[PDB]
Amino acid sequence: DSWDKDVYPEPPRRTPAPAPQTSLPNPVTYLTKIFDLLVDRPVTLAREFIEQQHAKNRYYYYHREFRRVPDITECEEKDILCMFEAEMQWRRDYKVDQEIVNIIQERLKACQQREGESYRQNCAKELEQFTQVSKAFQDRYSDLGAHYSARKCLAKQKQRMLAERKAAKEAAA
Amino acid sequence: MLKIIIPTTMLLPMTWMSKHNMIWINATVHSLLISLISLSLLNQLGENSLNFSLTFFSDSLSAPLLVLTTWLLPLMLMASQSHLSKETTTRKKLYITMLILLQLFLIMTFTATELILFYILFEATLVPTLIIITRWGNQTERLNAGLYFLFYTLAGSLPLLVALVYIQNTTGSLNFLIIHYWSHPLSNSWSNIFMWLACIMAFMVKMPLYGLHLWLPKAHVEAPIAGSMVLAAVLLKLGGYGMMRITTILNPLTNYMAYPFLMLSMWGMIMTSSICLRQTDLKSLIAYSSVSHMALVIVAIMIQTPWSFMGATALMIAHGLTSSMLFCLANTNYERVHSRTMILARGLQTLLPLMATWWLMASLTNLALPPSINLIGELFIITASFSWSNITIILMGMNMMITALYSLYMLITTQRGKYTHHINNIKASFTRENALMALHILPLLLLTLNPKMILGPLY
Amino acid sequence: MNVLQIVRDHWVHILVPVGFVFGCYLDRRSDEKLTAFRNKSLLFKRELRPNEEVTWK
Amino acid sequence: AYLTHQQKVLRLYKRALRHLESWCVHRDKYRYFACLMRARFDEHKNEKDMVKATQLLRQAEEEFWYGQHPQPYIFPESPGGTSYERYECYKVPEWCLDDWHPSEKAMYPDYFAKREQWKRLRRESWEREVKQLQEETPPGGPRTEALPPARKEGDLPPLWWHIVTRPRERPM
Amino acid sequence: KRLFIIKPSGFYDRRFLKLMRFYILLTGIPVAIGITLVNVFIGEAELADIPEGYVPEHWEYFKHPISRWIARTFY
Amino acid sequence: IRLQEDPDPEDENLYEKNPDSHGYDKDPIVDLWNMRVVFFFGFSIVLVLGSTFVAYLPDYRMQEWARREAERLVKYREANGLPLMESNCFDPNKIQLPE
Amino acid sequence: APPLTLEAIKDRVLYVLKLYDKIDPEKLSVNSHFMKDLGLDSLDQVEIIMAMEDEFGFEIPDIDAEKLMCPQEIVDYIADKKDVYE
Amino acid sequence: MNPFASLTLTTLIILTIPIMMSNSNIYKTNLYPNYVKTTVSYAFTLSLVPLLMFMHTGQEMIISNWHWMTLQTVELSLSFKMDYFSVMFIPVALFVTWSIMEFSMWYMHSDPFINRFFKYLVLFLITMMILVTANNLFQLFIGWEGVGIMSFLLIGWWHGRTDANTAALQAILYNRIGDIGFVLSMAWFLTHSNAWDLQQIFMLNNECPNMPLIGLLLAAAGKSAQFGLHPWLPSAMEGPTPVSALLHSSTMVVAGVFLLIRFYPLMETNKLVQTMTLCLGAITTLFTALCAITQNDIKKIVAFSTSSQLGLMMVTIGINQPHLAFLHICMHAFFKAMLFMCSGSIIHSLNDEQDIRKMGGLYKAMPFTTTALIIGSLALTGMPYLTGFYSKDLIIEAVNMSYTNAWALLMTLIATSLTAAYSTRIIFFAFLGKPRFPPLVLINENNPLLINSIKRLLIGSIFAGFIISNNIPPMTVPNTTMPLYMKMTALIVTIMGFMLALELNNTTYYLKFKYPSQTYKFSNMLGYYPSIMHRLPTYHNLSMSQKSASSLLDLIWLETILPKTTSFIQMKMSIMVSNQKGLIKLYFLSFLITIMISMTLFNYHE
Amino acid sequence: IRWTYARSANIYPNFRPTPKTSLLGALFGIGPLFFWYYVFKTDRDKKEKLIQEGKLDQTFNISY
Numbered sequence A: 001d002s003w004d005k006d007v008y009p010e011p012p013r014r015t016p017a018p019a020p021q022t023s024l025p026n027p028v029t030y031l032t033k034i035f036d037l038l039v040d041r042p043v044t045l046a047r048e049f050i051e052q053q054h055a056k057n058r059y060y061y062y063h064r065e066f067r068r069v070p071d072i073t074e075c076e077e078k079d080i081l082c083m084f085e086a087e088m089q090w091r092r093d094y095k096v097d098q099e100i101v102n103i104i105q106e107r108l109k110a111c112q113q114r115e116g117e118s119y120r121q122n123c124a125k126e127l128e129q130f131t132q133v134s135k136a137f138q139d140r141y142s143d144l145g146a147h148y149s150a151r152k153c154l155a156k157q158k159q160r161m162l163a164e165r166k167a168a169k170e171a172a173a
Numbered sequence B: 001m002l003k004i005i006i007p008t009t010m011l012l013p014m015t016w017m018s019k020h021n022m023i024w025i026n027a028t029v030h031s032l033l034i035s036l037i038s039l040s041l042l043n044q045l046g047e048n049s050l051n052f053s054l055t056f057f058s059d060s061l062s063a064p065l066l067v068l069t070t071w072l073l074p075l076m077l078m079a080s081q082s083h084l085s086k087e088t089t090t091r092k093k094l095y096i097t098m099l100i101l102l103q104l105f106l107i108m109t110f111t112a113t114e115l116i117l118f119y120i121l122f123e124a125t126l127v128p129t130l131i132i133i134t135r136w137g138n139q140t141e142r143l144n145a146g147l148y149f150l151f152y153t154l155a156g157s158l159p160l161l162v163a164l165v166y167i168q169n170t171t172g173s174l175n176f177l178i179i180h181y182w183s184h185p186l187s188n189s190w191s192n193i194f195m196w197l198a199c200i201m202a203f204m205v206k207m208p209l210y211g212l213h214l215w216l217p218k219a220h221v222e223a224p225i226a227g228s229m230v231l232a233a234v235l236l237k238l239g240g241y242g243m244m245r246i247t248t249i250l251n252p253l254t255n256y257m258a259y260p261f262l263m264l265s266m267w268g269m270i271m272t273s274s275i276c277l278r279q280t281d282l283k284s285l286i287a288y289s290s291v292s293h294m295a296l297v298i299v300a301i302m303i304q305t306p307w308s309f310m311g312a313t314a315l316m317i318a319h320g321l322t323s324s325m326l327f328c329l330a331n332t333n334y335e336r337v338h339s340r341t342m343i344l345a346r347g348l349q350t351l352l353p354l355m356a357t358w359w360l361m362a363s364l365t366n367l368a369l370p371p372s373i374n375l376i377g378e379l380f381i382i383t384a385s386f387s388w389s390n391i392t393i394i395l396m397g398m399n400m401m402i403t404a405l406y407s408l409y410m411l412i413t414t415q416r417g418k419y420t421h422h423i424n425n426i427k428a429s430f431t432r433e434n435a436l437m438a439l440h441i442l443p444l445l446l447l448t449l450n451p452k453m454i455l456g457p458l459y
Numbered sequence C: 001m002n003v004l005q006i007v008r009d010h011w012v013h014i015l016v017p018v019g020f021v022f023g024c025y026l027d028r029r030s031d032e033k034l035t036a037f038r039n040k041s042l043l044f045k046r047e048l049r050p051n052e053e054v055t056w057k
Numbered sequence D: 001a002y003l004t005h006q007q008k009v010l011r012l013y014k015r016a017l018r019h020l021e022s023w024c025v026h027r028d029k030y031r032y033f034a035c036l037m038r039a040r041f042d043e044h045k046n047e048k049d050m051v052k053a054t055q056l057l058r059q060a061e062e063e064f065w066y067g068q069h070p071q072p073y074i075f076p077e078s079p080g081g082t083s084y085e086r087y088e089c090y091k092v093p094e095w096c097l098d099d100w101h102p103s104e105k106a107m108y109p110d111y112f113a114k115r116e117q118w119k120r121l122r123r124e125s126w127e128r129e130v131k132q133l134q135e136e137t138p139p140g141g142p143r144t145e146a147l148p149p150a151r152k153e154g155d156l157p158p159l160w161w162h163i164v165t166r167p168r169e170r171p172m
Numbered sequence E: 001k002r003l004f005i006i007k008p009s010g011f012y013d014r015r016f017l018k019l020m021r022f023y024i025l026l027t028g029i030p031v032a033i034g035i036t037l038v039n040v041f042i043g044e045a046e047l048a049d050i051p052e053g054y055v056p057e058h059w060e061y062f063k064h065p066i067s068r069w070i071a072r073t074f075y
Numbered sequence F: 001i002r003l004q005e006d007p008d009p010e011d012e013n014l015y016e017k018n019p020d021s022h023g024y025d026k027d028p029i030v031d032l033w034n035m036r037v038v039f040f041f042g043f044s045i046v047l048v049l050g051s052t053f054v055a056y057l058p059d060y061r062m063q064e065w066a067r068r069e070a071e072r073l074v075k076y077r078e079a080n081g082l083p084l085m086e087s088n089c090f091d092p093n094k095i096q097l098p099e
Numbered sequence G: 001a002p003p004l005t006l007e008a009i010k011d012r013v014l015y016v017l018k019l020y021d022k023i024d025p026e027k028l029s030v031n032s033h034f035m036k037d038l039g040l041d042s043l044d045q046v047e048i049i050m051a052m053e054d055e056f057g058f059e060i061p062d063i064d065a066e067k068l069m070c071p072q073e074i075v076d077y078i079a080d081k082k083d084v085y086e
Numbered sequence H: 001m002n003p004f005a006s007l008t009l010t011t012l013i014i015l016t017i018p019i020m021m022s023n024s025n026i027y028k029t030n031l032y033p034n035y036v037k038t039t040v041s042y043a044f045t046l047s048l049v050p051l052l053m054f055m056h057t058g059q060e061m062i063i064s065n066w067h068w069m070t071l072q073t074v075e076l077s078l079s080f081k082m083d084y085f086s087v088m089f090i091p092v093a094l095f096v097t098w099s100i101m102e103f104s105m106w107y108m109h110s111d112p113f114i115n116r117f118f119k120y121l122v123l124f125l126i127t128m129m130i131l132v133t134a135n136n137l138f139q140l141f142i143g144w145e146g147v148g149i150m151s152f153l154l155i156g157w158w159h160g161r162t163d164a165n166t167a168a169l170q171a172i173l174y175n176r177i178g179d180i181g182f183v184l185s186m187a188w189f190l191t192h193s194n195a196w197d198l199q200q201i202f203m204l205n206n207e208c209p210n211m212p213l214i215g216l217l218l219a220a221a222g223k224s225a226q227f228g229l230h231p232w233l234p235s236a237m238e239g240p241t242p243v244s245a246l247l248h249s250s251t252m253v254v255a256g257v258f259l260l261i262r263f264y265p266l267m268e269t270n271k272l273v274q275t276m277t278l279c280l281g282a283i284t285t286l287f288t289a290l291c292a293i294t295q296n297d298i299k300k301i302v303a304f305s306t307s308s309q310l311g312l313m314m315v316t317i318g319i320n321q322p323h324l325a326f327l328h329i330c331m332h333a334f335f336k337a338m339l340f341m342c343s344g345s346i347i348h349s350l351n352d353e354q355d356i357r358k359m360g361g362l363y364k365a366m367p368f369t370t371t372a373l374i375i376g377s378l379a380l381t382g383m384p385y386l387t388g389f390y391s392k393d394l395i396i397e398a399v400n401m402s403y404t405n406a407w408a409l410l411m412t413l414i415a416t417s418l419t420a421a422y423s424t425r426i427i428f429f430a431f432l433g434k435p436r437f438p439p440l441v442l443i444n445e446n447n448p449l450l451i452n453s454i455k456r457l458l459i460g461s462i463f464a465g466f467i468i469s470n471n472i473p474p475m476t477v478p479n480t481t482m483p484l485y486m487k488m489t490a491l492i493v494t495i496m497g498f499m500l501a502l503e504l505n506n507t508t509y510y511l512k513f514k515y516p517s518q519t520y521k522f523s524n525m526l527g528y529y530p531s532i533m534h535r536l537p538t539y540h541n542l543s544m545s546q547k548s549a550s551s552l553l554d555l556i557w558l559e560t561i562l563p564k565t566t567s568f569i570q571m572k573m574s575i576m577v578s579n580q581k582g583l584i585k586l587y588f589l590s591f592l593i594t595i596m597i598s599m600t601l602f603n604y605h606e
Numbered sequence I: 001i002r003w004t005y006a007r008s009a010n011i012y013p014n015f016r017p018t019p020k021t022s023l024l025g026a027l028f029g030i031g032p033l034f035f036w037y038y039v040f041k042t043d044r045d046k047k048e049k050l051i052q053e054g055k056l057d058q059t060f061n062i063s064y
């Protein structure tokens, strides 16, 4: 197709062998056969003519990379230039992590429909995967406000190990 | 900008020196053309706001408003050109001068980069509007209405001016960028409390908020149609644009202080829509309808969550195009019957068949069916408000239930009924009216396909 | 075809698009004033093209 | 105006009979109970005292009001009826035709020409109706809601335009 | 026994409806043809790796050719 | 009399003079040009051509790029056996917590 | 269905009155005023219009009903109400 | 990925073609209704195909397509979900809407806007189709509001009828109260589960959705016209007969019950809310049926009979029987739609007479229409091996063999017996008796369109109960071993209901004088519901709007506190500071004080 | 026309401040506003105190 199974795991199909014991013909074979010979075949014929027409004049496009830049943890206070470079990179990291959750949601939705009735247990691995994504995404970006910024993200982050330091020190006793 | 501001300014000498009768033609030509040019700014980059010069910049919030204002400019021209065709050439030229000037301030305000520059032009919009409502108004209460509109806006704006210059002396520059990247924690203190109140009240009055809203039923109803749109379709959102920008610094004091405003808007929006349930003037019906929608924007801003800001801009743009439409609708009847009472002209679908259809989609857009942009805005706020508090869905939905009754109420009272016997001057709708109405609703339904353009700066 | 009349009533039409040209011109008259850090952001810092004078105008 | 007693009792008979229609249903039951209703009305017909007549009415109106069918049968072409103003939404006033485009005006030359004759006839007779009114106004303004007819020849009845040219009850 | 049908004049409304069908489609079909013609003759681009020396100047980082053309000029 | 003013003259039936009247002004010829300009410079080029421009704009607020940046990050992270996205936002090793 | 026409109404009009046993068949002039010659009680005409009310499927309001007193009148009012114009 | 994906999706695209074709006016204005009907017929026959692979392969589809917006971490986009409930509902809905569209030609053969009316019907069908075929909750809301507004126009189709707008206003009013819970579930399913697609919601396993399901239930009550929100269905009879026969019989009011069917897997986890569903269905069944029997208009009787049916369906949903409800959906869809244009045929023939009193003598006067009525009435009862049996008494047997809410079980048994009760009233007064209509009889059902429309649906009531039950895969828990006595109570209560209702109806034949029972009064004016409901809170809310709200608070108080008081304050001393008497002595004396107070008294020196 | 005047303009000039109007202004006005303030503030205090301790869990709630 146009992707890889490692990003969208679709377990290999399991199709049965249709062997109708009853002598009366199966109609569903007939409407499928006429559909191929009346609709599907002209569609394929037009598509291949379209594909070769595209192949004659091939113009290419590439993908834009953004080289890693210093983030806001090493950004000097009131350094407006490093403020901008850090803020833009963090928001770009925000967009990709939003898409990371987007991918996991698609896999989970595929987990439901593909299993149908057996959605509960067949791909609970999808459920725990989304559990790890959503929980970590909660402490990573959630509750940052409509004016979220890399300074705010550190502020929320700093609250975690500060609370964690108190807990573990209490735990060590 | 310079690429939109300069053509806008250059329309001013063009209309003044235009031909005697070609004023309406040429002004409509290029105002549509300038709107086409402003479609270029609908694109926004990844996260950094589109910056052109030091004084002018755009983001994924200003540009959706910029196109709305410049697209509006042709609409006021055709709507007003009905009655304005019966006065002196200079008087008509003076009007087109004033709409062009009024639009000019709106374009420059929305792309202002310095908060002081924002405030100067934000308040400067009063002068073109104030003269519109007063000089060319068609009633007697306009004289009191103009004073109410001017004084309410100014009484709130003046504390902002004192507050704004205070930020300049203390923090430094007030550029919308340097403010964002140098946000400092506004700690809870009585001086900060009034700092918060001053920077907020100015934009609240122009929303308007429940209680600081009595200027709207006077200003909007008495204003001429070329004005009756802008006081409801763009410059109410101008107060909205002020809120979403000024709240960059007002954290975290906003959540502690937002409670009086939330309760006033969240409870008052039920009362305001209750006024619409029993009204006598069609213009007042839509006017109070605007208050309910803007009140929903008022609460939306203050949670300061990604979903709320999106639904804020979505409703903000959609309501403006909607509320502008209904004012065109009330204008058509008000010209034919020369009165604003609802029950006077009951029965229009019998006589005007397509006018009912335009009224149907107009009242439907206010009804906010899915996937209309009104619904895509209100629904987003409901989810954001519900996450803030579960109880608010009782109030949020109650308006959604209440807004159905009145939004279809003028549909029943005016269109769906026996035609009034005594009235005999109803004429087949001019192709200007129908063309204008299509210019309102066609972009709205077309916008439904791609809400990303108008979804705000957080998509 | 009585060109005087055309330039009497339609000389006003050209007045706007030249303003738009002026608007574009001033935008490209101003942007180079904001040059400062041109190809200086380390994200977009890249070795200049060989037979090309400079990066983004 | 003042509804006299003999009219009001007739209104009771008409309405009460229509109410037992919703009760009796079957025709033979109707004709029986109607005759008892009819004669029970006629048995008390020599009351020289008009006060006693209202005293007889003092229990009849409450008798109707509690014996009334909660879903009385009313013909659809009437208030409460299922077909009340059902075809009203096509009653386009005739004066709207004056706004038709000439292409549509020329589509029906005969009817439009006759419409002109009626319009010319209405124009001529309007002032004739006008002076007819003040020629026979009652001293002190119009006393009754009624409307006097055309007394002389060649005069249309006063205030005839809307009544005569009203849309048909079945316009479609 | 057929008779007249007094109805509101819809000719001007018919004019308005017909005109959009003539005006909104005057540039409607040519762009609709242009959108389809572009997608089938010049076609849609395909993903390719970054060349050794060629940086993708501005408009290159886009799939659709007409979308690339808008990126070429304008922005 | 009190005041000497002409009363409300009338509401001029714009359809009466030209039966095909357009509702823009009195003079027919310029009024005929008035739809020819509002329709042409309206629906045609700012509604149809306007829609195609905005609807087919170069991708706004890059998402399919961000959608692109997802697969190689997750593919790299899941293949070598590392949690696909860390709980901490910014690197915590260089954080110097107070005391 | 063809519209209810004037000749159709009147033929249906004296259809009901002659079907009334209180009226002799012979004395049935189309303009025979109910009180004058037939001499039926003032309650009776109120009960005959109900049969006419059911006959044509309509309503005769009491305001007009009490004045309606001729077979010509009954066909007149019904014809005028249901736009009968031959 | 068979043709089952593409071919089932194009069914909607075939349906929406007439809507686009209408504005171009290429259609011949004479034969537009024929254009609509054969278009739906083509879609119907095209919609048969999704069935054949459903029984054969047992496969279901989820068709997602063009992305709407990548809003944060949710992917709101157009998407369709073919499944057991979907792939068969469209063939039933298309078959029903095809039959009525054929019938609508004969009935509405005089409405001047007939092209507009058929345009509205197709638009409703499109909105209903996307309602039954929706993957995200937002898309479900598109239909959930599309059918509601489409009902509003179609109910007020006759336009000028003053009370029709009230019912049209009533229909949207009760719907909006239903949508209260819909938007509540929307917000909850987006906040606590970060989605609106049904796939994610089920995977996330929100095992305790107390408030969502409560909001989910409230959505059904407004749309399915349950108790507390029923009366808009009886008032919807003010619309034309085909209008209610399509929308308010088997294709629009079904939305409410259908919503729970979509969220059935999440239904079983909760126990409190599901009891409320069977509780709400129980009261809805009786009260609608209790008001059904004592009504004297044919349209009202069928309306209350419908609302009694949907009350029964939610009773099934209560005790973990969602799919059996969908079986009840299809079986109820066939015959109930039939009964409406059987009533429509007699109503039009009897010069628009709908009052059940001015009827009678139609069994031999209208043979086919009477024949269809008996078939439809018997389906309401559930005669064995007929369409009614394959759903209804299976539920009654199912509800008996369950841990029900005692008092909830009894009401349905009283209700199902009550179903026969008003059924006799329809057959008794309208057909079995002596004629009572106006003298000029215009009875005629010989029109081919009327015969063909009823004939097509009538064979669907003799059959298709056995056909569907056998064809659908066996996937419900079978109640095999019950004690005999309650196994056939459904036949007992109907026969018992048949016997006494006939005797009481025939009691009217007895010349005995009638006494108005106060219990009969309570039933006849719809449980006193409309006059308290539709008069008291409407007055109170509107009263609060005028004396308060608009007046008092606004226009008096809010204008006299901030704006006018400041004007008065600025004014009271304005009269003062501008009334200097002009005497030089007073001016210079004020100078003395101003000099004196400033120099030393204010300590301005230091 | 008189009715529109009576409902729109001839109200405040004919308004007379009395304890009945004054009390109704407070009861129908500031009253419910504080009522909703108390209800919402208590819920926010309830919610805020609960997730601080760790009572409510939003392991899957991310968008807000």
Ligand SMILES: CCCCCCCCCCCCCCCCCC(=O)O[C@@H](COC(=O)CCCCCCCCCCCCCCC)COP(=O)(O)OC[C@H](O)CO
Binding pocket: B155, B156, B159, B162, B163, B166, B167, B191, B192, B194, B195, B197, B198, B201
């Ligand atoms: C028409 C009535 C008002 C309508 C509503 C307006 C908005 C409500 C708030 C009103 C006050 C607005 C003025 C705010 C000025 C700038 C606020 C600001 O930035 O905060 C300062 C705080 O502002 C103030 O102190 C002044 C504002 C508080 C209110 C007192 C003056 C305004 C009220 C009276 C005049 C207006 C009322 C109308 C009178 C006719 C911080 O400075 P500081 O106090 O910390 O100074 C440093 C140090 O601590 C000591 O100075």
